[PDB]
Amino acid sequence: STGQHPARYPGAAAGEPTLDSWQEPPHNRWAFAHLGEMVPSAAVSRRPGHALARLGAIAAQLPDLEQRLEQTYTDAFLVLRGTEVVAEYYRAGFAPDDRHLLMSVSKSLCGTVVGALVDEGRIDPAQPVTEYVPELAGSVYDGPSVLQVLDMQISIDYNEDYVDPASEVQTHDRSAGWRTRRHGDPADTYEFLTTLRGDGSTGEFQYCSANTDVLAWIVERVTGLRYVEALSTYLWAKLDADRDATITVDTTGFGFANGGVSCTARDLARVGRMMLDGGVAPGGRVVSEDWVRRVLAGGSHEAMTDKGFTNTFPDGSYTRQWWCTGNERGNVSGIGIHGQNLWLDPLTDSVIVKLSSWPDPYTEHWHRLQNGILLDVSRALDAV
Amino acid sequence: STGQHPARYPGAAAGEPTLDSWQEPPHNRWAFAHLGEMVPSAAVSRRPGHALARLGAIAAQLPDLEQRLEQTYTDAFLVLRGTEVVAEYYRAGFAPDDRHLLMSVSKSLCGTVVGALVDEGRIDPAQPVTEYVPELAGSVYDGPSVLQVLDMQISIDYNEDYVDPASEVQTHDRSAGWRTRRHGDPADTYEFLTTLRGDGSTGEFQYCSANTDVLAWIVERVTGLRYVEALSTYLWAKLDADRDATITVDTTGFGFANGGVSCTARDLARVGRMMLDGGVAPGGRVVSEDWVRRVLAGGSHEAMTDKGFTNTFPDGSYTRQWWCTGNERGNVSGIGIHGQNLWLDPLTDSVIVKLSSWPDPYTEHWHRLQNGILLDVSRALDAV
């Protein structure tokens, strides 16, 4: 058993409603107002085909920028300098206020919610995961601290060979509803997490999406809120965002914290703005000044042995669900597969959002090109 | 085979993407901007518990109205007199701008899209369904006219005993993704429709949700647009609505035209406003003056043998996806299970929206109470 989880609505039984029960009472009162949470759904537009390029001042310093954005399958691109949008690009067929999947940039949002609860004193990163989720006893998360989950310094047997249905990576997707279920699969994301094992060692960085969903589980046990609501209460609702975000949910209503958030490029930039404002957003403080400093400072360099990162960023590291380049600019970024970045450039008080759809989740090629763009744009913002 | 269907995106192969392919190129460029169409998803609110009752002037004439609304499981209630909102009610936990499932009120919206195409001369109601969807040859829809589908005057072997998985009604839900699939089930809604049979007789009203999905299929073959887009282009985008509507989609992206639309109460009232304005909306004409007159005039009374309707409305009928009461007021309504109405009161130039969640999809009890409320409110709007 995976223990108590936040009810889908006031008074709901565990796991209710399901796809087969949402039309029945008492579920239907909630379900009729939230059907997209149960059944795939399309927007019917209230508004009645060409790329929008407003690259502003940086266009002069980067003459080939639009082409470089096209080449890296850019869907939305936005540069926020201070409080001002100074450059924007949206591909044909993607509107400025359309939402885009964040993939693992979602992790940086989850870490922020954890940070908010640390600020309130409701989570102690030094405590073992099992202090908050006892049901993870007997798993690879039995022993490690919450901080080690935040920094992803837990050794886990987690096959990333996606094409293999036996792989943990595809099983994670199936347990969450991102792929069709196979017989014997865990019922939901919580159950999947409990199946995870490792040799017990910690201290070395291992990028693993399961870590973020454990963080979300901790958030739920501490607050009693569905992660969906916690993400709003502790972050999204304080941003003065233009639109709601969305997040995919599994069959229990648990948000796919590691990868399933979608939002507009402009709204994502508000998260970066908050980080560069010492943790404060328009609607109040989100995380502490100390939390932001720790993110900008980076994690242990010794722990970071991912050559896919360190070949480009030799002094790079990872902490609290953010990638830290350790470059001369101190750049830090949320990153997600297929070319998503929430990129922070503190030197120029700027945030760069790039949301993309590379054909491949990862290649060295794509990251070389993408990082070249983000660094070039960052440098273009320097005083001259 | 069910023939050609509108691609999910420009250049998409038939049936693509699926839940198992949306992360792969070229699908992912579309899917990353529309993930809710593939995977159940929740809103993450940009805004940081008590019923809202603003019953206005009619409160004096109906002292017990709020209680009567509570008793009929009212989620949203709105009265539009002319262009003015004169009364509103929303239950605790349902915001004025929250969207609500329309159930079969969705049918009246679909019929309106058909009417728009009749106005343009692209659909001839006198023509057989097979003129537009040849692949329905050999089915119960081989022979009947488009108008007979519009008026639901086709005899169909369609078991409405929902609890029986063998029933056409539950199979319809499963084929569309409203319920978990069973082995052997049709792949999608189109295929389900082709399995339908009947004795060949026509002319008598038989309420059947399959009819509306056939209308949507015709709309797609005539326009080349996904029904989702057609519903926007020919109706929703002309309403000057506050919010997009949504519609559930099956695995091919086909909108559940018969029952799957959700929208706000205020926006639904704009559809009624258009009907009482001779078919014209803020963004242009939607249907012809003649179409509206035919709806208000009613269908054949001889055809209407549903005692669940005629016991209350002896001179009632059905045409073009609207229920026509034939009462002294000439009331006409869209109706959906669990207490949804888009109710037109031409005498007072008013529209009443009531969106509810009765525990039961239908009982004589609920309809007696609900119709009592709609009639009382209508009469309260009369000049005195």
Coordinates of N, CA and C in Angstrom, one line a residue, chain A residues 163-338:
Chain A
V163 N 12.9 2.3 -25.3 CA 12.3 1.4 -26.3 C 11.9 0.1 -25.6
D164 N 12.7 -0.3 -24.6 CA 12.4 -1.5 -23.8 C 11.3 -1.3 -22.9
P165 N 10.2 -2.0 -23.1 CA 9.0 -1.9 -22.2 C 9.3 -2.3 -20.7
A166 N 10.4 -3.0 -20.5 CA 10.8 -3.5 -19.2 C 11.5 -2.3 -18.5
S167 N 12.0 -1.4 -19.2 CA 12.7 -0.3 -18.7 C 11.9 0.5 -17.7
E168 N 12.6 1.0 -16.6 CA 11.9 1.8 -15.6 C 11.4 3.1 -16.3
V169 N 12.1 3.6 -17.3 CA 11.7 4.9 -17.8 C 10.3 4.8 -18.6
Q170 N 10.1 3.7 -19.3 CA 8.8 3.6 -20.0 C 7.8 3.1 -19.0
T171 N 8.1 2.3 -18.0 CA 7.2 1.9 -17.0 C 6.7 3.1 -16.2
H172 N 7.5 4.1 -16.0 CA 7.2 5.3 -15.3 C 6.1 6.0 -16.1
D173 N 6.3 6.1 -17.5 CA 5.3 6.7 -18.3 C 4.0 6.0 -18.3
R174 N 4.0 4.7 -18.3 CA 2.8 3.9 -18.4 C 2.0 4.0 -17.0
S175 N 2.7 4.0 -15.9 CA 2.1 4.1 -14.6 C 1.4 5.4 -14.4
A176 N 1.8 6.4 -15.2 CA 1.3 7.8 -15.1 C 0.3 8.2 -16.1
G177 N 0.1 7.3 -17.1 CA -0.8 7.5 -18.2 C -0.3 8.2 -19.4
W178 N 1.0 8.4 -19.5 CA 1.7 9.0 -20.7 C 1.8 8.0 -21.8
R179 N 1.6 6.7 -21.5 CA 1.6 5.6 -22.5 C 0.6 4.6 -22.1
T180 N 0.2 3.7 -23.0 CA -0.8 2.7 -22.8 C -0.2 1.7 -21.7
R181 N -1.1 1.3 -20.8 CA -0.7 0.4 -19.7 C -0.5 -1.0 -20.3
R182 N 0.5 -1.7 -19.7 CA 0.7 -3.1 -20.0 C 0.2 -4.0 -18.7
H183 N -0.1 -5.2 -19.0 CA -0.6 -6.1 -17.9 C 0.5 -6.2 -16.8
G184 N 0.1 -6.0 -15.5 CA 1.0 -6.1 -14.4 C 1.7 -4.8 -14.0
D185 N 1.4 -3.8 -14.8 CA 2.0 -2.5 -14.5 C 1.5 -1.9 -13.1
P186 N 2.3 -1.1 -12.5 CA 1.8 -0.5 -11.2 C 0.6 0.3 -11.5
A187 N -0.3 0.4 -10.5 CA -1.6 1.0 -10.7 C -1.5 2.5 -10.9
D188 N -0.5 3.1 -10.3 CA -0.3 4.6 -10.3 C 1.1 4.9 -10.1
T189 N 1.4 6.2 -10.1 CA 2.8 6.7 -10.0 C 3.4 6.3 -8.6
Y190 N 2.5 6.5 -7.5 CA 3.0 6.2 -6.2 C 3.5 4.7 -6.1
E191 N 2.7 3.8 -6.7 CA 3.1 2.4 -6.6 C 4.4 2.1 -7.4
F192 N 4.5 2.8 -8.5 CA 5.7 2.6 -9.3 C 6.9 3.0 -8.5
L193 N 6.8 4.1 -7.8 CA 8.0 4.6 -7.1 C 8.5 3.6 -6.0
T194 N 7.5 2.9 -5.4 CA 7.8 1.9 -4.3 C 8.5 0.7 -4.9
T195 N 8.5 0.5 -6.2 CA 9.1 -0.7 -6.8 C 10.6 -0.4 -7.1
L196 N 11.0 0.8 -6.9 CA 12.4 1.2 -7.3 C 13.4 0.7 -6.2
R197 N 14.6 0.2 -6.8 CA 15.6 -0.3 -5.9 C 17.0 0.3 -6.3
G198 N 18.0 0.2 -5.5 CA 19.3 0.7 -5.8 C 20.3 0.0 -4.8
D199 N 21.6 0.2 -5.1 CA 22.6 -0.5 -4.2 C 22.8 0.2 -2.9
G200 N 22.1 1.3 -2.7 CA 22.2 2.0 -1.4 C 23.1 3.1 -1.3
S201 N 24.0 3.3 -2.3 CA 25.0 4.3 -2.3 C 24.3 5.7 -2.7
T202 N 24.9 6.7 -2.2 CA 24.4 8.1 -2.5 C 25.6 9.0 -2.7
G203 N 25.3 10.2 -3.1 CA 26.4 11.2 -3.2 C 26.8 11.6 -4.6
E204 N 26.5 10.6 -5.5 CA 26.8 10.9 -6.9 C 25.5 11.3 -7.7
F205 N 25.6 12.3 -8.5 CA 24.4 12.7 -9.3 C 24.0 11.6 -10.2
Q206 N 22.7 11.3 -10.1 CA 22.1 10.5 -11.2 C 20.7 11.1 -11.5
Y207 N 20.6 11.6 -12.7 CA 19.4 12.2 -13.2 C 18.3 11.1 -13.3
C208 N 17.3 11.3 -12.6 CA 16.2 10.3 -12.5 C 14.8 11.0 -12.2
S209 N 13.9 10.9 -13.1 CA 12.6 11.6 -13.0 C 11.8 11.1 -11.8
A210 N 12.1 9.9 -11.3 CA 11.4 9.4 -10.2 C 11.6 10.2 -8.9
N211 N 12.8 10.8 -8.9 CA 13.1 11.7 -7.7 C 12.1 12.8 -7.6
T212 N 11.7 13.4 -8.7 CA 10.9 14.6 -8.6 C 9.4 14.2 -8.2
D213 N 9.0 13.0 -8.6 CA 7.7 12.6 -8.2 C 7.7 12.2 -6.7
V214 N 8.8 11.7 -6.2 CA 8.9 11.5 -4.7 C 8.8 12.9 -4.0
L215 N 9.4 13.9 -4.6 CA 9.3 15.3 -4.0 C 7.8 15.7 -3.9
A216 N 7.1 15.4 -5.0 CA 5.7 15.8 -5.1 C 4.8 15.0 -4.1
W217 N 5.2 13.8 -3.9 CA 4.5 12.9 -2.9 C 4.8 13.5 -1.5
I218 N 6.0 13.9 -1.2 CA 6.3 14.5 0.1 C 5.5 15.8 0.3
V219 N 5.4 16.6 -0.8 CA 4.6 17.8 -0.7 C 3.1 17.5 -0.3
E220 N 2.6 16.4 -0.9 CA 1.2 16.0 -0.6 C 1.0 15.6 0.8
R221 N 2.0 14.8 1.3 CA 1.9 14.3 2.7 C 2.0 15.4 3.7
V222 N 2.9 16.4 3.4 CA 3.1 17.5 4.3 C 1.9 18.5 4.3
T223 N 1.3 18.7 3.1 CA 0.3 19.8 3.0 C -1.2 19.2 3.1
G224 N -1.3 18.0 2.7 CA -2.6 17.4 2.5 C -3.3 17.9 1.2
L225 N -2.6 18.6 0.4 CA -3.1 19.1 -0.9 C -2.7 18.2 -2.0
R226 N -3.6 18.0 -3.0 CA -3.2 17.4 -4.3 C -2.0 18.2 -4.8
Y227 N -1.0 17.5 -5.4 CA 0.1 18.3 -6.0 C -0.3 19.3 -6.9
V228 N -1.4 19.0 -7.7 CA -2.0 20.0 -8.6 C -2.3 21.3 -7.9
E229 N -2.9 21.2 -6.7 CA -3.3 22.4 -5.9 C -2.1 23.0 -5.3
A230 N -1.2 22.2 -4.8 CA 0.0 22.7 -4.1 C 0.8 23.5 -5.1
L231 N 0.9 23.1 -6.3 CA 1.7 23.8 -7.3 C 1.1 25.2 -7.6
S232 N -0.3 25.3 -7.5 CA -0.9 26.6 -7.6 C -0.7 27.4 -6.4
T233 N -1.0 26.8 -5.2 CA -1.0 27.6 -4.0 C 0.4 28.1 -3.6
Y234 N 1.4 27.3 -3.8 CA 2.7 27.7 -3.4 C 3.5 28.4 -4.5
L235 N 3.1 28.3 -5.7 CA 3.8 29.0 -6.8 C 2.9 29.7 -7.8
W236 N 2.1 28.9 -8.6 CA 1.5 29.5 -9.8 C 0.6 30.7 -9.4
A237 N -0.2 30.6 -8.4 CA -1.2 31.6 -8.0 C -0.5 32.9 -7.5
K238 N 0.8 32.9 -7.3 CA 1.5 34.0 -6.8 C 2.2 34.8 -7.9
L239 N 2.2 34.3 -9.1 CA 3.0 34.8 -10.2 C 2.3 36.0 -11.0
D240 N 1.0 36.2 -10.7 CA 0.2 37.1 -11.5 C 0.3 36.6 -13.0
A241 N 0.1 35.3 -13.2 CA 0.2 34.7 -14.5 C -0.9 35.1 -15.4
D242 N -0.7 35.1 -16.7 CA -1.8 35.4 -17.7 C -2.8 34.3 -17.7
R243 N -2.3 33.1 -17.7 CA -3.2 31.9 -17.9 C -2.9 30.9 -16.8
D244 N -3.8 30.0 -16.4 CA -3.5 28.8 -15.7 C -2.4 28.1 -16.4
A245 N -1.7 27.3 -15.6 CA -0.9 26.2 -16.2 C -1.7 25.0 -16.2
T246 N -1.3 23.9 -16.9 CA -1.9 22.6 -16.8 C -0.9 21.6 -16.4
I247 N -1.3 20.5 -15.9 CA -0.4 19.4 -15.6 C -1.2 18.0 -15.8
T248 N -0.5 17.1 -16.5 CA -1.1 15.8 -16.7 C -1.3 15.1 -15.3
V249 N -2.3 14.3 -15.2 CA -2.6 13.6 -14.0 C -2.7 12.1 -14.3
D250 N -2.3 11.3 -13.3 CA -2.5 9.8 -13.5 C -3.9 9.5 -13.0
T251 N -4.2 8.2 -12.9 CA -5.5 7.7 -12.6 C -6.1 8.1 -11.2
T252 N -5.1 8.4 -10.3 CA -5.5 8.9 -9.0 C -5.6 10.4 -8.9
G253 N -5.3 11.1 -10.0 CA -5.3 12.5 -10.0 C -4.0 13.1 -9.6
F254 N -2.9 12.3 -9.5 CA -1.6 12.8 -9.1 C -0.9 13.4 -10.3
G255 N -0.5 14.7 -10.1 CA 0.1 15.4 -11.2 C 1.5 14.8 -11.5
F256 N 1.8 14.7 -12.8 CA 3.1 14.2 -13.2 C 4.2 15.3 -13.0
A257 N 4.6 15.4 -11.7 CA 5.4 16.5 -11.3 C 6.7 16.6 -12.1
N258 N 7.3 15.5 -12.5 CA 8.6 15.5 -13.1 C 8.6 16.0 -14.5
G259 N 7.5 16.0 -15.2 CA 7.5 16.4 -16.6 C 6.2 16.9 -17.3
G260 N 5.1 17.0 -16.6 CA 3.8 17.1 -17.2 C 3.2 18.5 -17.2
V261 N 3.9 19.5 -16.8 CA 3.3 20.9 -16.8 C 3.4 21.5 -18.1
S262 N 2.3 22.2 -18.5 CA 2.3 23.1 -19.7 C 1.9 24.5 -19.3
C263 N 2.6 25.5 -19.9 CA 2.2 26.9 -19.7 C 2.7 27.8 -20.8
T264 N 2.4 29.1 -20.8 CA 2.8 30.0 -21.8 C 4.3 30.3 -21.6
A265 N 5.0 30.8 -22.6 CA 6.4 31.2 -22.5 C 6.5 32.4 -21.5
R266 N 5.6 33.3 -21.7 CA 5.6 34.5 -20.9 C 5.4 34.2 -19.4
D267 N 4.5 33.3 -19.2 CA 4.2 32.9 -17.8 C 5.4 32.2 -17.2
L268 N 6.0 31.3 -17.9 CA 7.2 30.6 -17.4 C 8.2 31.6 -17.0
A269 N 8.4 32.6 -17.8 CA 9.4 33.6 -17.5 C 9.2 34.3 -16.1
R270 N 7.9 34.3 -15.7 CA 7.6 34.9 -14.4 C 8.2 34.0 -13.3
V271 N 8.4 32.8 -13.5 CA 9.1 31.9 -12.5 C 10.5 32.3 -12.4
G272 N 11.2 32.6 -13.6 CA 12.5 33.0 -13.6 C 12.7 34.4 -13.0
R273 N 11.7 35.3 -13.2 CA 11.7 36.6 -12.6 C 11.7 36.5 -11.1
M274 N 10.9 35.6 -10.6 CA 10.8 35.4 -9.1 C 12.2 34.9 -8.6
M275 N 12.9 34.1 -9.3 CA 14.2 33.6 -8.8 C 15.2 34.7 -8.8
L276 N 15.1 35.6 -9.8 CA 16.1 36.7 -9.9 C 15.6 37.9 -9.0
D277 N 14.5 37.8 -8.4 CA 14.0 38.7 -7.4 C 14.1 38.2 -6.0
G278 N 15.0 37.3 -5.7 CA 15.3 36.8 -4.4 C 14.2 35.9 -3.8
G279 N 13.3 35.4 -4.7 CA 12.3 34.5 -4.2 C 10.9 35.1 -4.1
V280 N 10.8 36.4 -4.4 CA 9.6 37.1 -4.2 C 8.8 37.2 -5.6
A281 N 7.5 37.0 -5.6 CA 6.7 37.1 -6.7 C 5.6 38.2 -6.4
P282 N 4.9 38.7 -7.4 CA 3.9 39.7 -7.2 C 2.9 39.4 -6.1
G283 N 2.5 38.1 -5.9 CA 1.5 37.7 -5.0 C 2.1 37.3 -3.6
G284 N 3.4 37.5 -3.4 CA 4.0 37.2 -2.2 C 5.3 36.5 -2.3
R285 N 6.0 36.3 -1.2 CA 7.3 35.5 -1.3 C 6.9 34.0 -1.6
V286 N 7.7 33.4 -2.5 CA 7.5 32.0 -2.9 C 8.6 31.2 -2.1
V287 N 9.8 31.5 -2.3 CA 10.9 30.8 -1.5 C 11.8 31.8 -0.8
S288 N 12.6 31.4 0.1 CA 13.5 32.3 0.8 C 14.6 32.8 0.0
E289 N 15.2 33.9 0.4 CA 16.4 34.5 -0.2 C 17.5 33.4 -0.2
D290 N 17.6 32.7 0.9 CA 18.6 31.7 1.1 C 18.5 30.5 0.1
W291 N 17.3 30.1 -0.2 CA 17.0 29.1 -1.2 C 17.5 29.5 -2.5
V292 N 17.2 30.7 -2.9 CA 17.6 31.2 -4.2 C 19.1 31.3 -4.3
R293 N 19.8 31.8 -3.2 CA 21.2 31.8 -3.2 C 21.8 30.4 -3.3
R294 N 21.2 29.4 -2.7 CA 21.7 28.1 -2.8 C 21.6 27.5 -4.2
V295 N 20.5 27.8 -4.9 CA 20.3 27.5 -6.3 C 21.4 28.1 -7.2
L296 N 21.6 29.4 -7.0 CA 22.5 30.1 -7.8 C 24.0 29.7 -7.5
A297 N 24.2 29.2 -6.3 CA 25.5 28.8 -5.9 C 25.9 27.5 -6.5
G298 N 24.9 26.6 -6.8 CA 25.2 25.3 -7.4 C 25.3 24.2 -6.4
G299 N 25.4 23.0 -6.9 CA 25.6 21.8 -6.0 C 27.0 21.4 -6.0
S300 N 27.3 20.2 -5.4 CA 28.6 19.7 -5.3 C 29.1 19.3 -6.7
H301 N 30.3 19.8 -7.1 CA 30.9 19.6 -8.4 C 31.3 18.1 -8.5
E302 N 31.9 17.6 -7.4 CA 32.3 16.2 -7.3 C 31.2 15.2 -7.6
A303 N 29.9 15.6 -7.2 CA 28.8 14.7 -7.5 C 28.4 14.6 -9.0
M304 N 28.7 15.7 -9.7 CA 28.3 15.8 -11.1 C 29.3 15.1 -12.0
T305 N 28.9 13.9 -12.5 CA 29.8 13.1 -13.4 C 29.1 12.8 -14.7
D306 N 28.0 13.6 -15.0 CA 27.4 13.5 -16.3 C 28.1 14.3 -17.4
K307 N 28.8 13.6 -18.2 CA 29.7 14.2 -19.2 C 28.9 14.9 -20.3
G308 N 27.6 14.5 -20.4 CA 26.7 15.2 -21.3 C 26.5 16.7 -20.9
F309 N 26.8 16.9 -19.6 CA 26.7 18.3 -19.1 C 28.1 18.9 -18.9
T310 N 29.0 18.1 -18.3 CA 30.3 18.7 -18.0 C 31.3 18.9 -19.2
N311 N 31.0 18.2 -20.3 CA 31.8 18.5 -21.5 C 31.6 19.9 -21.9
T312 N 30.4 20.4 -21.8 CA 30.1 21.8 -22.1 C 30.4 22.7 -20.9
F313 N 30.0 22.3 -19.7 CA 30.1 23.1 -18.5 C 31.0 22.3 -17.5
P314 N 32.3 22.4 -17.6 CA 33.3 21.6 -16.7 C 33.0 21.8 -15.2
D315 N 32.6 23.0 -14.8 CA 32.4 23.3 -13.4 C 30.9 23.2 -13.0
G316 N 30.2 22.5 -13.8 CA 28.7 22.5 -13.6 C 28.3 21.6 -12.5
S317 N 27.1 21.7 -12.1 CA 26.5 20.9 -11.0 C 25.0 20.9 -11.0
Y318 N 24.4 20.3 -10.0 CA 22.9 20.3 -10.0 C 22.5 20.4 -8.5
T319 N 21.5 21.2 -8.3 CA 20.9 21.3 -6.9 C 19.5 21.7 -7.0
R320 N 18.7 21.1 -6.1 CA 17.3 21.6 -5.8 C 16.5 21.7 -7.1
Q321 N 16.8 20.7 -8.0 CA 16.0 20.6 -9.3 C 16.4 21.6 -10.4
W322 N 17.5 22.2 -10.2 CA 18.1 23.1 -11.2 C 19.5 22.7 -11.7
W323 N 19.7 22.8 -13.0 CA 21.1 22.6 -13.5 C 21.9 23.9 -13.4
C324 N 23.1 23.8 -12.8 CA 23.9 25.0 -12.6 C 25.2 24.8 -13.5
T325 N 25.3 25.7 -14.4 CA 26.4 25.6 -15.4 C 27.8 25.8 -14.8
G326 N 27.9 26.6 -13.8 CA 29.2 27.0 -13.2 C 30.0 27.8 -14.2
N327 N 29.4 28.3 -15.2 CA 30.2 29.1 -16.2 C 30.5 30.5 -15.6
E328 N 31.2 31.3 -16.4 CA 31.7 32.6 -15.9 C 30.5 33.5 -15.6
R329 N 29.4 33.2 -16.2 CA 28.2 34.0 -16.0 C 27.3 33.6 -14.9
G330 N 27.6 32.4 -14.3 CA 26.8 31.8 -13.3 C 25.4 31.4 -13.8
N331 N 25.3 31.1 -15.1 CA 24.0 30.7 -15.6 C 23.5 29.4 -14.9
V332 N 22.2 29.4 -14.7 CA 21.5 28.3 -14.1 C 20.2 28.1 -15.0
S333 N 19.8 26.8 -15.1 CA 18.7 26.6 -16.0 C 17.8 25.4 -15.6
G334 N 16.5 25.6 -15.8 CA 15.7 24.4 -15.9 C 15.8 23.8 -17.3
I335 N 15.8 22.5 -17.4 CA 16.0 21.9 -18.7 C 15.0 20.7 -18.9
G336 N 14.5 20.6 -20.1 CA 13.6 19.4 -20.4 C 13.9 18.9 -21.8
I337 N 13.7 17.6 -21.9 CA 13.9 16.9 -23.2 C 13.2 17.6 -24.4
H338 N 13.8 17.5 -25.6 CA 13.3 18.0 -26.8 C 13.5 19.6 -26.9

